[PDB]
Each structure stands twice: as structure tokens, then as C-alpha cells.
Amino acid sequence: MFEIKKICCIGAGYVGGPTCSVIAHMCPEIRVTVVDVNESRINAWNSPTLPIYEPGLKEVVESCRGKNLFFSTNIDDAIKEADLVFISVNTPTKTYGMGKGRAADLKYIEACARRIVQNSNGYKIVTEKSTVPVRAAESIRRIFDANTKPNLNLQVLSNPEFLAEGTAIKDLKNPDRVLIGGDETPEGQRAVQALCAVYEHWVPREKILTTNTWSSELSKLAANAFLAQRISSINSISALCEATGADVEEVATAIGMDQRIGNKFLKASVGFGGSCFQKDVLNLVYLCEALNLPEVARYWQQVIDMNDYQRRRFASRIIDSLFNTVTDKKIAILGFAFKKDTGDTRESSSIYISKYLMDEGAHLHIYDPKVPREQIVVDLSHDQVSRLVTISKDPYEACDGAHAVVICTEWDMFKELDYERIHKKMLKPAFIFDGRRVLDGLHNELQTIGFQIETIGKKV
Amino acid sequence: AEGTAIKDLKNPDRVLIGGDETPEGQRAVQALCAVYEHWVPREKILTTNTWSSELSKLAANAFLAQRISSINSISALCEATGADVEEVATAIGMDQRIGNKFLKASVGFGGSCFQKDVLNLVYLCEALNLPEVARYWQQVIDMNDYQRRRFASRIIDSLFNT
Amino acid sequence: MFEIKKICCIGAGYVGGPTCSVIAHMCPEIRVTVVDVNESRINAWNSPTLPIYEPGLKEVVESCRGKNLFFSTNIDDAIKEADLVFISVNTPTKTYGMGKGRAADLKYIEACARRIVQNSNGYKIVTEKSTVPVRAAESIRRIFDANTKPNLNLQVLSNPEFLAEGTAIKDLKNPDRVLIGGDETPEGQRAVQALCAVYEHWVPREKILTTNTWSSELSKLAANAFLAQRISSINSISALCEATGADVEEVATAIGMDQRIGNKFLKASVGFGGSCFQKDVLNLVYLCEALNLPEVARYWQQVIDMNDYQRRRFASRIIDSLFNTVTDKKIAILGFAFKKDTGDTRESSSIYISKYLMDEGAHLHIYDPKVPREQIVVDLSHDQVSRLVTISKDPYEACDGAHAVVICTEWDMFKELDYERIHKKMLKPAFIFDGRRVLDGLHNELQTIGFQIETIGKKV
Ligand SMILES: O=c1ccn([C@@H]2O[C@H](COP(=O)(O)OP(=O)(O)O[C@H]3O[C@H](CO)[C@@H](O)[C@H](O)[C@H]3O)[C@@H](O)[C@H]2O)c(=O)[nH]1
Ligand SMILES: O=c1ccn([C@@H]2O[C@H](COP(=O)(O)OP(=O)(O)O[C@H]3O[C@H](CO)[C@@H](O)[C@H](O)[C@H]3O)[C@@H](O)[C@H]2O)c(=O)[nH]1
Ligand SMILES: O=c1ccn([C@@H]2O[C@H](COP(=O)(O)OP(=O)(O)O[C@H]3O[C@H](CO)[C@@H](O)[C@H](O)[C@H]3O)[C@@H](O)[C@H]2O)c(=O)[nH]1
Numbered sequence A, C: 001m002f003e004i005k006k007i008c009c010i011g012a013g014y015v016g017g018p019t020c021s022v023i024a025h026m027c028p029e030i031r032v033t034v035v036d037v038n039e040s041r042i043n044a045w046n047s048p049t050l051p052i053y054e055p056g057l058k059e060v061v062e063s064c065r066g067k068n069l070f071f072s073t074n075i076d077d078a079i080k081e082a083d084l085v086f087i088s089v090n091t092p093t094k095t096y097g098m099g100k101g102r103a104a105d106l107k108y109i110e111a112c113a114r115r116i117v118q119n120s121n122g123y124k125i126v127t128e129k130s131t132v133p134v135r136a137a138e139s140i141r142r143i144f145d146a147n148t149k150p151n152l153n154l155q156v157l158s159n160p161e162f163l164a165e166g167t168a169i170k171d172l173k174n175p176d177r178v179l180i181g182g183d184e185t186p187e188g189q190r191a192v193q194a195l196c197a198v199y200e201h202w203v204p205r206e207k208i209l210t211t212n213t214w215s216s217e218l219s220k221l222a223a224n225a226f227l228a229q230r231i232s233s234i235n236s237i238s239a240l241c242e243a244t245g246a247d248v249e250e251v252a253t254a255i256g257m258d259q260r261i262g263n264k265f266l267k268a269s270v271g272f273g274g275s276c277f278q279k280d281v282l283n284l285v286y287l288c289e290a291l292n293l294p295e296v297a298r299y300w301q302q303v304i305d306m307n308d309y310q311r312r313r314f315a316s317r318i319i320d321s322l323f324n325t326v327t328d329k330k331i332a333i334l335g336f337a338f339k340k341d342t343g344d345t346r347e348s349s350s351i352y353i354s355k356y357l358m359d360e361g362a363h364l365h366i367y368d369p370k371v372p373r374e375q376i377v378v379d380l381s382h383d384q385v386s387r388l389v390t391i392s393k394d395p396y397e398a399c400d401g402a403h404a405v406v407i408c409t410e411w412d413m414f415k416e417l418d419y420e421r422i423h424k425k426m427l428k429p430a431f432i433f434d435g436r437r438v439l440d441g442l443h444n445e446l447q448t449i450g451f452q453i454e455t456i457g458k459k460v
Numbered sequence B: 001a002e003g004t005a006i007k008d009l010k011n012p013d014r015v016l017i018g019g020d021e022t023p024e025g026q027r028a029v030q031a032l033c034a035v036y037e038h039w040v041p042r043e044k045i046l047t048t049n050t051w052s053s054e055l056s057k058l059a060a061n062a063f064l065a066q067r068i069s070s071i072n073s074i075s076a077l078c079e080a081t082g083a084d085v086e087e088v089a090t091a092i093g094m095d096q097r098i099g100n101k102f103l104k105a106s107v108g109f110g111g112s113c114f115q116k117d118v119l120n121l122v123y124l125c126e127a128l129n130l131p132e133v134a135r136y137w138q139q140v141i142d143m144n145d146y147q148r149r150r151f152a153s154r155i156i157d158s159l160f161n162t
Helices: A014-024 A039-045 A057-064 A075-081 A107-119 A136-146 A168-173 A187-201 A211-245 A250-256 A277-290 A296-322 A349-356 A373-379 A395-399 A420-424 A444-450 B005-010 B027-036 B052-082 B085-093 B114-127 B132-156 C015-024 C038-047 C057-064 C075-080 C107-119 C136-146 C167-171 C189-199 C213-244 C247-257 C278-292 C294-321 C350-360 C371-379 C384-388 C397-399 C420-427 C444-451
Strands: A006-010 A031-035 A069-072 A082-086 A122-128 A152-158 A178-182 A208-211 A331-335 A364-369 A388-389 A402-409 A432-434 A452-456 B015-018 B047-049 C006-010 C031-035 C069-071 C086-088 C124-130 C152-158 C178-181 C208-211 C330-334 C362-366 C387-391 C404-407 C429-436 C452-454
Touching: A006 A014, A006 A075, A014 A031, A014 A057, A014 A069, A014 A082, A014 A168, A014 C213, A031 A075, A039 A069, A057 A168, A069 A075, A082 A107, A082 A187, A082 A452, A082 C278, A082 C404, A082 C429, A107 A122, A107 A136, A122 A136, A122 A187, A136 A152, A136 A211, A152 A211, A168 C429, A178 A187, A178 A211, A187 A208, A208 A211, A211 A250, A211 A277, A211 C038, A277 A296, A277 C247, A296 A349, A296 A402, A296 A432, A296 A452, A331 A349, A331 C152, A349 A364, A349 B047, A373 A388, A395 A420, A395 C362, A420 A444, A444 A452, B015 B027, B015 B052, B015 C387, B027 B047, B047 C247, B052 B085, B052 B114, B052 B132, B052 C213, B052 C247, B052 C294, B085 C208, B085 C213, B114 B132, B132 C294, C006 C015, C006 C075, C015 C031, C015 C057, C015 C069, C015 C086, C015 C167, C031 C075, C031 C178, C038 C069, C057 C167, C075 C107, C086 C107, C086 C189, C107 C124, C107 C136, C107 C152, C124 C136, C124 C189, C136 C152, C136 C213, C152 C189, C152 C213, C178 C189, C178 C213, C189 C208, C208 C213, C213 C247, C213 C278, C213 C294, C294 C404, C294 C429, C294 C452, C330 C397, C350 C362, C362 C397, C371 C387, C384 C387, C420 C444, C444 C452
Parallel strands: A006 A031, A006 A082, A031 A069, A082 A122, A122 A152, A178 A208, A331 A364, A331 A402, A364 A388, A402 A432, A432 A452, B015 B047, C006 C031, C006 C086, C031 C069, C086 C124, C124 C152, C178 C208, C330 C362, C330 C404, C362 C387, C404 C429, C429 C452
Antiparallel strands: A152 A178, C152 C178
8 A cells, every 4th residue: 555654735825734734733644845936925834923814723833843744945855755746826817818807827737737747756646736626637637648757657636625714724624525536547546545545544434535536626616606606695685685674684594494405604795705716606607618508607607796796786885875975085994804714815805895985085994803904905906095095903093083884804803892982983974884794783782872784684 | 822923924814804895995905905915815815894803803802712711611610520621622622513722721811812802892792782792701701710719729728728 | 352242222312213223324233223112203213204304314224224223112122132222312301399490300311220220131231322411321320239130230331422413314424523431440441442342333443532431421511512602602793793783694704714713603593402502501500500610600501591682682673673563463484493404393493483473472374394293383382372373384375475484494495485476475564584594695686576684693
């Protein structure tokens, strides 16, 4: 039996970082090196404050860094030395050309493949580990099939990651299932077994699914789409609730007790964010079009268009409540991260909402406990940002003289705020726009304070 | 044709002279006719009126361009079904009523003629209230656009779309 | 070295009859039996007057019928006793279901296949022989693959006939090329060689093209469409001639002198007919739609649309020239066959011109030299045929008392008609609509006679 003794992971991001830190923690007798071109990101991994916020991540890293888990920019030597090589890079969507704005760019995957071949001899297992794998494993394989050395035997595997940011550690420590794709050769099932034995250190065997490379990638795509679909479906219902005086939260509860539907992912919101769902459905639509499946394409397209509609519907409500003129009005934006417990803003609903108010010439004051100030200004760019955007150091500086408070992220702190204090120094009418349903049950207090609280999935 | 101009001029298939159907006229056509008679045999010189000459040219270039586009369309169909357009072009070409010339499938036709010529024929037909005829010849340009674009996509595709 | 001694042909049509008759004539020592379900048709092939009209066929057929060539209707024994079996039946366009009015119905090709399997043992070569082969060869093989007997070895070849009705004998005696398709196996190439040897009795080696089954059918589909395209291209130009004042016969000559284009199939007409051209193009469009090639389907569609327009334009001119009514007006239709020297009416533009005029209330008088009376009545209906349609025994009958004469078929004899006699008895002004250009050079004669002679590709 082949035993993985040394692991190398190209990509030290939200996926590779936490994944390898867990692998190393659960597997003391196997050396894990995480590598990356980003010198800044690598140094942070080796420091007291990590480059990404993720609850419980620190304690995991600090228990095996320097012992068992390593972070290096020396990508060559880590590739040369390893039995398993994870490729966990990002695939940004093409900004030009055919597929512009929709299809994923595989250049970094391709580049990594080329670099593996350069720095590899003998047997190595190369596993593609991403959140939205788009023809990835086949791209790697195509590089490996075309650039061969003597005694170079590289096996390509697919191993899509299911963790969700904010809950990475729990998800990795206790996953619903691990999925591994690998060719139906004996060569083949041997490489699959090797990685399968790595997971077996902490994942029960019954939760490890092994299939072929494509079926693996297509499963990931669909699972992602199904998840995005639940949020878009409930958000569609939220529109319908506001229009008819019912409550989306009660509706959602009645929906979710049907054990066939389930009660997860039915929290209506301003719209789904994150570097996964949109990228995922857009690539699924693209694939379908490429395969002459206009019907399938058309069906999944609805998940994005519903998300897009949810965002504009919510922005429009804010503008509306402000007599359709927000020029030179102070408005607090509470929460920027796409999700609570993360510093990640990729495709965050907060970016879109902010831009819609920007176009209306609002003076925005953005607060987020974890998103770095610099990131916020990059996200809201390409002179207009200098005019309209201020980054508040605490929420109260944000609502000091604001016309409206816009809650976009379900940080638990936003429930704890002193709404007595905030209302006293706001210009009236004072609006709170709750895009997360965080302030549910506080409605009566807020109304008797003097707010006019508007939330999604419920209108008076 | 450019690239074989000297051959084509020394030994043309036909020469085409359009003049007014007056006697003034036919005297003008004969003089020019007599310039070409220096190397061109008399039964290779066609004499007609002005417009009948200009329409025949337009048609003539349109008919050739259509040849390329038709075989190009077949090329697409071959790629979808595992045949060879060169083998098909042979079988088609051997029919003496079709002719074997100008059936070489390609990335698409170029030249200062064909595209300008077809689009003009279209425009004329639209002006004369013949939308049926316009739509017909417009398919020669559209197929050519398609062939080029299909070729461009295959390159991009094969390089992982990046 | 397998040699063919006994040939059975299923289909005693315009393809099957003439083809096998020539094969019999050119190859004395090989017995050729032609079979059909249609008793009437077979009795006729055995009698003094044949079921179809084809210049020269009478001599070919009577020189070897009963020596070497037979007609049977006993399909079962002919199949059983044969080395090579042609399938030359018709494939009507579907009248219902998906592909209605466009796609070819393979119900006869399949039923044939099925009967061969029932009556066959040992080795036999089965060749599909048609004008428009649409997935023919595959269908057969699909039937044979699934219905195997012990020691049955059936080979499927493709062999599209290029004969043109009217000149069938000449074409079969001296074809431009012969096209045989068979599997690129050795089983295989041997059946192709054995059919190749049939033709090598009168067709030289380098005129016989041998490719694979599908290539062969695609080659025929394409060739038919290219020829159809020439007719439509010149017909389009004819429309342009009429609005601008030039001559399509003259413009066609200028075109034809270009050896790259060639001077054949540049005769403008009322609209191409026959069981081939339209069926071929519609099936090419349908195939393309099924392979997701909209652009290619859109391209060849124009060949049909243009032909339709040619027919419709010519018709409008007739009603236009007769003061926009033909109600209770006598009109002569000269020529009903799709082309000259044949009895065949399938898809004839005469059928269309006649119907269009009847819908406007014209009392028509039809004459054709070789089309049977009964055929004309079928074609023209689906009772209104009782009121409006008379069938004339000679041209001069059709013309006596008539307001107009429409020529739809380029019969040679039409040039030779006595026009002084025809004018004398017509109602004035008398019109001649030449939809075939057969009366060029006769213009002056006919105008001076007093006619108003309107022809396609030239306007007054
Ligand atoms: O009922 C819900 C559920 C989620 N969200 C939002 O959905 C987005 C995505 O959230 P979440 O799925 O928790 O975070 P991700 O990091 O995107 O994780 C998902 O995306 C990963 C990438 O595909 C998958 O691997 C995980 O399995 C899947 O949970 C966020 O903007 C959430 O605010 C809400 O709108 N309502
Ligand atoms: O089988 C072929 C033949 C040509 N081409 C292409 O078609 C374009 C035009 O070809 P060609 O006709 O040889 O060049 P031209 O100089 O445009 O000449 C044509 O056009 C002239 C008007 O420009 C006419 O006068 C000529 O008679 C006619 O041959 C070129 O890009 C060729 O490569 C093909 O793709 N396939
Ligand atoms: O210059 C022309 C030539 C033909 N036609 C018309 O088009 C029709 C078809 O004529 P033709 O092609 O000779 O008769 P087919 O029996 O259909 O034969 C053609 O189609 C056959 C299959 O049907 C092929 O096998 C032959 O190769 C091909 O010549 C007739 O109605 C003609 O009047 C024109 O209008 N103008």
C-alpha cells in the first residue's frame, strides 16, 4: 500500500489554509507544507495574527505549526518533496473574451500544473481541491499527458472542498461527506485509496464517497447550485410576503418542518454573497450552453437573477423611504463581510447595496468588525469613493447624524447595540433597514424608541 | 484573380463589354473589342448593354462566393459527424454540372471583392423591393462570418478557454 | 475473391427499374431480378408499355428481359436466391409527428431490412440505393445487428444513384462518377470490392469513388443541395433582371463562361421540381437542426424559400397581367411533368401553378405529352377539380377559347406548335407566360402575331 508521508498544498487561501491546518492536526505523522506566491499572506500564516479570520483557526494552527505544518513561499522544494500535491488556487472569472463576466479563468490551475511537472520525479498524487471546480482535473490531466518525463507518474484526483467560511474548522473536523474523484483504472483506484486513507484518520469511512473525476466535479457544481437555489427560493417568497402582509420567517418555519424539504438555508436575506454561489451558477449556465442545453441553462439562470432582484429591491426600499433623494445624506452601512464570522467580502451583498446608494450620492459610513479598511475601499472602486465613502471605527460614528442604518451582515454584535443612544443623534425620520432579520423580536422596543424599522420578508 | 492576374489576363475565360444600344454606341464597343482582339479570340468576347454587364459581374462574384460558403457550411457538418470535407468536395466536384473548382474549404473567403460585392447586391435588392432576394444572398456573408468565428472558437477552446 | 452472380432489387421505381435494367444489359452473365409489392407496376414492367417513361429504356429492357432480367413481386424467393440486394424504395416526408412536412419517413427502408433478415442465409451484400439517403445505411445495419441468425453474414453498403429522370439511360450508361460506401473494416472492404467489380464492367476504375457509408450519404446530400442552389441562385437573379430590365439568359451566359462556375444548371425556371431536390434540402436542414447547427440550416433553407418565391412571383404575374381576376377565365397549362421527357409529376411546379390559379377561380386546361390523365387529377385535389379542371388530348384543344397559355414544362414540341393557329382561336388580348424560356428567339414572331408574351427573367 502506498502511504502519503508528505503533503504539499499550492494555495494558502480560505480553502488550502484551514484544510491543511486540520489535516496536519488530525495526522501527526505526516508533514504538511502550505505554499503560496503571496509573500505577505505566507508571513501572516507564520505570525500571531493570521491573514484570514476564521473562528478557532488560530488554536488549530498554533498547535502544529513548526512541528507538522509549515507555511512557505518555497513552492519548488515543497513540490519536489511531496507525495500528495493539493492545488487550491483561485479561478477568477474572465474579464474579457468569450465567456466574459461569466466563465471561470483556469490560468492559475494551468500554471500550477506546469510547475508540478517541472519540479516532479517518480510517483506523486496531484489533487484538485476547490469550492467551484470548473473542468479543473481535466486541465491538469491534459498538461500531465502532454509533458511527460521518464519515471514520472502523476495521478490526478478531484477532491472538492465543502467547508463554509465562518464555520470552517467545525465543517473540516466533522464533515457531512468527503468526495473524491479518480480515474476508473487500477492506478487509478490506488491513488484514491491513498488519499482516502488520509481522511480515514478522522472521517468515518461511510462518509467518504469515491467516484470518477468528472462526476465529482459535477456533483460539487450541482450541490452548490441547490444551496444557492434554496436562498433564492425563500427570498422570492420574501417579496411575496411583503406584498401581501405575511411574514417570511413564519412561512419559512412552516416550509422547513416538512422533513423532505429540511429546515436549513431558508433564512431570507439581502442576497447571497461569497466567492462560491454566483461563480458556481454562472459556470453551470455556461457549461449547459456549451453542451446545447438551453433549457437547463435557463433554469439555473433564475437563481442569479432572483438574487440580483433581491438586492435591487432592498436598495430601492431605502431610496424610497428617503423621498427618492439621498444626495448628501449620511447613511450607516452595518456589516460588510458577505457572511458573519469572516473578513471575506468576495461578492458581498454589502458591495452592491453600497454602490446603489453611491449612485444616489449618499454619504456612506461603513462599519465592519473584521473586514480591513483597505479592502472596503478597493471593493468600492473603478474619486467617487473619496467623496462618498468613510470607514467608521465603530458603529456609533457611523450612525451619528445618519438618516438610515442599513444592516447587511448578521454580526451578533448588531443585536447588542444601544439603540437608545443611536436614535438620539440620528436625523429624523430615523430608519433601520434590517437586511438580515437580526433585529427580530426587538421591533416593539425600536418603534417605542422612535425608529421606523423596515425589514425584508415583512412590510407594514 | 489576384495572385494569378497575369495568367488570367493573358488567357481569360471571357471578356465582357457593356455599351449603349445605340449605333454610337456599337461603334464605341467595337473599338475596345478590337483592342482585346489582339490576343483574345473573338468567341471569348461578350458584347452587351451597360447594365447587363454590371449585373453579370455582381452575379458572377456572388456565385463564386456562394461556392466557398456552401462547402464551408458542409465543413461544419463534417466536423459534427466525422467525415472529411476534402473527400466530400471530391465526390461533389466530380459532377460536371457542379464543377470541381472553388470547392476548397477554408477559414473563410477574403479579398476586396466578395464581401463588398455580396453586400452591394443585397442593398440593391432591398432598394428594388426584393427582400426575398436580399435575404438569400445575405446568407453568403453570414455563413462566412460563422466559419471564421467557429475557427476562432476552436483555438480558444483547445487552450482551456484562457 | 467473392463474385456476384445473382442480384435482387427491392423497388421497381424510377431508380430501381432503370438501374437494374442497365446492370442487366451491361452484365449478361449476372442474373438480375427486380421485385415490388405493387402488382400493377410489375405487370407493366413485363408488358409492351412500361409503367414509367424514360427515353431509351424500352430498348434496354426488351433486349434482356427474360434472358437475364426479370420482374417478379415474389419478393421472398428473389431475396433468398441473391448475392447482392439493392434497397431502392421511397422515403416519403412525414405527414405527422416531429419533423412533420420535412423529415424523411424510414418506414419502408426498415420493413425491407426486416424482410431480408427473414429470408436470408449465408453471405449477402445489401446496398442502399437512392437519390436522397437520409440515415438509410445506418438504419438497415441497426436492424441486422439486432436480428442475427446462425451463419448469417450481411454486409451493408451505400450506393447513391445519380441518374436524372429524362436522361436516365445516358447517365447510367456513362456516369460522372460512381459512389460506393462501406465499412473501413476488412469485411467490409471486400463487399465494396465486389460491388466495384459489378460497375467495372462498363465504368472504368478511376471513376468509382469508394469511401465510408456515412461520407457517401453526406456526399449525396450535399451534392443534391449544391445543384439545387444553382437553380435558385439563377432564379434569384432572374427576379433582379425583371425589376431592372436585363435578360437572365444573357446574364447566365456571362456567368457560365467562368470555368470555375461552369455553364450547366443555369437555366432559370418557374421552380425546380422532382422527388429529390426539395426533399434533400429539407432533410439537410433537419439534420443540421438536430446537430445544433442553426447557421448551416439557415443557409440551405434559403434554397427552398427562394424556389417558393419563384413559383409565387410567377403566379402573381399571371393574375396581375389578367387585370387581377381570372374568375371564369380559360387558361391553358402546357406541360405538367417536373422536367421534360418524363412522366413524373412529383413536386412539379405545374402542380403548384395550377392550384394557385384554381384558388383564383380559373377554368384550367392541362396538356402534357407523357403524364397520364389520372395522375393529374390526383395531384390537383385533396370536387373543385370537377368544376375547374379539364384534361386536353392535344395542345390546340387547351388553347381554343383561352385567355392565356402558361408553359410549365420545357417540352421540345412546344417550340414546334402552330402559333398562328393558336392565336386565331384565343380570346384577345392573348397572353403567353413562358415559365421555361423555351420560346426565346420566337419573341418577335409571336408579338407580331399579336401575342403579349411575358417570360421570367425579362420584363416589358
Ligand atoms: O439561509 C441562508 C443561507 C445562506 N445565506 C447566505 O448565503 C451565502 C453563502 O453562505 P454560506 O453557504 O454559509 O457560506 P459559503 O462560504 O459560501 O459556503 C457555501 O459555499 C461553499 C462553496 O461552495 C460550499 O463549499 C459550502 O458547502 C457552502 O455552505 C452568504 O452570503 C450567507 O449570508 C443566506 O442568504 N440565507
Ligand atoms: O476554393 C476556394 C477558393 C478561394 N477561396 C478564398 O476566397 C477568397 C477570394 O479568392 P479569389 O477569387 O481567388 O481572389 P479574388 O482576387 O478576389 O478573385 C475573384 O474575385 C475577382 C473580383 O475581385 C473576380 O474578378 C475574379 O474572377 C475572382 O476569381 C480568398 O481569400 C481565397 O483564399 C477559398 O476559400 N476557397
Ligand atoms: O438549369 C436548370 C436545371 C434544372 N431545373 C429544374 O430542376 C428540376 C430537377 O431537374 P433534374 O436535376 O435534371 O432532375 P432529377 O431527376 O431530380 O435529377 C437531379 O437530381 C437527381 C436526384 O433526383 C440526381 O441524382 C441527379 O444527379 C440530378 O441531375 C427540374 O424540375 C428542372 O426543370 C431548372 O430549373 N434549371
